[PDB]
Amino acid sequence: GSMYQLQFINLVYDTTKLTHLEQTNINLFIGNWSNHQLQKSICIRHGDDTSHNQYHILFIDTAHQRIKFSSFDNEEIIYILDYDDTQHILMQTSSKQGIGTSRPIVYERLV
Ligand SMILES: [Cl-]
Ligand SMILES: [Cl-]
């Protein structure tokens, strides 16, 4: 079959400043995920100041199991990840000063 494109998302954050539940919630999204229709995979990991593909977390929603983040290189585009279960998360796109938020797209964990 076809090869996919793989995008790295290295979330940059100091764990020692978070609550246990905020850590839990980020951890729901760490992993390797794919969407068949886009032929796209994302690899979400905790990175650091040295990393490439750096993203900054804007909000950790422990009420609804979501995180919001933006790339270091563009503060305007906001990504939202919604937890479903251990094998499924959903991505939406919003923005700092635009109108609207996109419909969720399911990413499945690569067994
Ligand atoms: Cl095949
Ligand atoms: Cl980079």
- What CATH code is carried by the domain that includes residue 67? 2.40.310.10
- Closest ligand to residue 10's CA: 2
Expressed as residue numbers, the domain containing 8 is: 1-111
**What one-letter code names the amino acid at 71?**
S
Is 41:75 a contact under the CB 8 Å cutoff?
A: no
Q: How far is CA 28 from CA 1, 23, 97, in A?
A: 29, 9, 28
Is 75:95 a contact under the CB 8 Å cutoff?
A: no
Strand partners, 61: 66
- Closest ligand to residue 1's CA: 1
Q: Tell me how many domains the chain contains.
A: 1
CA 2 / ligand 1 centre spacing (Å): 7
Q: Which technique was used to obtain these atomic coordinates?
A: X-ray
What residues are neighbours of ligand 2 (ion), with CB under 5 Å? 52
Q: What is the DSSP letter of 99?
A: S
